[PDB]
Curated annotation (Swiss-Prot), chain C:
Protein origin, superkingdom: Viruses
Transmembrane spans: none
Location within or outside the cell: Virion
Name of the protein: Capsid protein
Shown part of the complete sequence: 127 to 189 of 189
Family: Belongs to the bromovirus capsid protein family.
Functional description taken from the UniProt entry: Capsid protein. Binds specifically to the subgenomic RNA4 to ensure selective packaging.
Source species of the chain: Brome mosaic virus (BMV)
Free-text note regarding domains: The N-terminal arginine-rich region binds selectively to subgenomic RNA4.
């Protein structure tokens, strides 16, 4: 007997002896849940590490050309004491208008000599065609003058020429948390 | 680590995906019916908040997770995207910065604003807006957007009001 | 006060507890003995307020 | 075996996929910049080995796993496939027999030559070639191929050289 | 009778071809750093003791020398502040910058040229110079790149 | 020694000390089985619950 092997009246049964047959391991069923917008995951930063983010408005891009923009930080972390601060894993993603002309991509590498050449070498690349319009520079830039980054632009290409402020781009960046966040200021100056 | 002989089971519309609500935090929703939209342009409606929770008593509440999905006629004209941000100066500017955004080309046409608004006055919403863009122009009421939000229970459903003052 | 050794004021508990927006409607006042130019002086405001949550975690890759 | 209510998490470009290297076996890589290719034809470059490990000392080394991915301008002209085999007599003949092959229509445009070359002289490679084909003709430097290989550490980084002979 | 590097320290070397020069005059050349380490990432690494030596054609002019110092305003004066110097007249055509730079941004040196003087004017690619430099080995060193790009 | 770390003759080996590196958790491989028509699932009803079914023929629908 085995599965629902419960009937009525007699009914013998025999099998055969050999070297088994079925697969060695057995099955497990599953059910991929359908996820909606934003349900994703915004992994928390790490130890004593802050994640400073902010965006930069786009520049009128052309046909199939690709522009660049030395990225600069905000006044807060723009302190010589914080400039020489260390960074962690970091990502870039981009918010853009709904009515978009063609599909396009974007990345970031050391102040490239050749602007288009960037895409031939960057670790990750925010692609529009992809479901995830963003790139993860995990350990890619871990450790670096929180100023170093300045000399190092970001690259963006477009299939169809396009306007400026036509799209922003955020940069969630891991970096050691400063000390300002806490304590006030010396009353005695 | 021997491989796992598995099997993706087929999911049929409206199946599973049960979404438990948090404790004390009750979820209440409704919807605003679209107003005619032009081709590729994106309208926006202030929060169509329901009077049920307009009392400064509860209007001065807080929120958390907030869903947003939509119903469109079968005769859906192409595709459309939707979302919500802080009374966006520029209309289309909203899509350039929301945490989520429901789309018609997505298996699940809905957007989850996971905690992105956690701890905000229930009133604090009206200074918000909902933005919807469409491929080709289209009518009003043509689409309904469903603001599914969770927050808390107040001090009224609890009981009626003054018999004799 | 400028005449004082400590050119600053402490609003300890003075404003403890308040919509981090409330403050907006509430201006700041400055008086001068001798008329004076603009950008003639700045003023900082070290303010205690509950730490937010952005400081930590990144952003949902899935948008 | 009750079903497992699971949930595929979204993977964003350059995420995870950490590729640990083997012990003692150090991995070193670089790249050769494409030379103009014609439409549908497939060029081939001998192994553009780096001088860093040209010394017969290390050139007489061995290998193992070997990756190969490529960077192409956003203005990528259609699609292209790439790989590597034994100084293939016929150029296109290489694609008819490599263990792996990076393609532009693949989510991950790269090829993993898993052990397929394990135990081969580091020099033994130069009598190898890298083959790349393109849908429509295209320029040179237009694409870069990245030979990511692992092998071992020698006896030099270890130290400088003769002060006074 | 050999030599050794340091703990967790790599010795990255490479050469730079000479640009022809005039006699008695001394040229300079910012540093041709190796791309592999041009990443601000490791470009901001720690260096150790480092040395420079030079291979040159046999058939070469009068005995000349060469060193390295901060972006020196005076090409010739760089030899008065040089820590060590590769002399041709010496039996050792090289200079040891031990602990002279021990502990500095791998990207620091960039803002710091190399100086070479010559008795008789001389051709380009007429002589090379190698730079055996101690620096902490970085990360990736022993693990591939995420295929997911 | 570790993986196939079995060779011939001597051959020492050393590593390095730091703060680890690899991911925290480790991998599991799988194989999505290909399912055919009807293999799916007709979940059984519940307690003291019947499942009554039946169909209704369509009506000429328009554009
Ligand atoms: Mg520095
Ligand atoms: Mg309030």
């Amino acid at each position: 007997m085995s599965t629902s092997g419960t009937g009525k009246m007699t009914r013998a049964q025999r099998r055969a002896a050999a070297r088994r047959n079925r697969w060695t391991a057995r099955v497990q069923p599953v059910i991929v849940e359908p996820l909606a917008a934003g349900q994703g995951k915004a992994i928390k930063a790490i130890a004593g590490y802050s994640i400073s983010k902010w965006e930069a408005s786009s520049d009128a891009i052309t046909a199939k050309a690709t522009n660049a923009m030395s990225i600069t930080l905000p006044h807060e972390l723009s302190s010589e004491k914080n400039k020489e601060l260390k960074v962690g894993r970091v990502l870039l993603w981009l918010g853009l208008l709904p009515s978009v002309a063609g599909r396009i991509k974007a990345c970031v590498a050391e102040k490239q000599a050749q602007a288009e050449a960037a895409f031939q070498v960057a670790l990750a690349v925010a692609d529009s065609s992809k479901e995830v319009v963003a790139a993860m520079y995990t350990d890619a830039f871990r450790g670096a003058t929180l100023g170093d980054l300045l000399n190092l632009q970001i690259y963006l290409y477009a299939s169809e020429a396009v306007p400026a402020k036509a799209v922003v781009v955020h940069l969630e960046v891991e970096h050691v948390r400063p000390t300002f966040d806490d304590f006030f200021t010396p009353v005695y100056r």
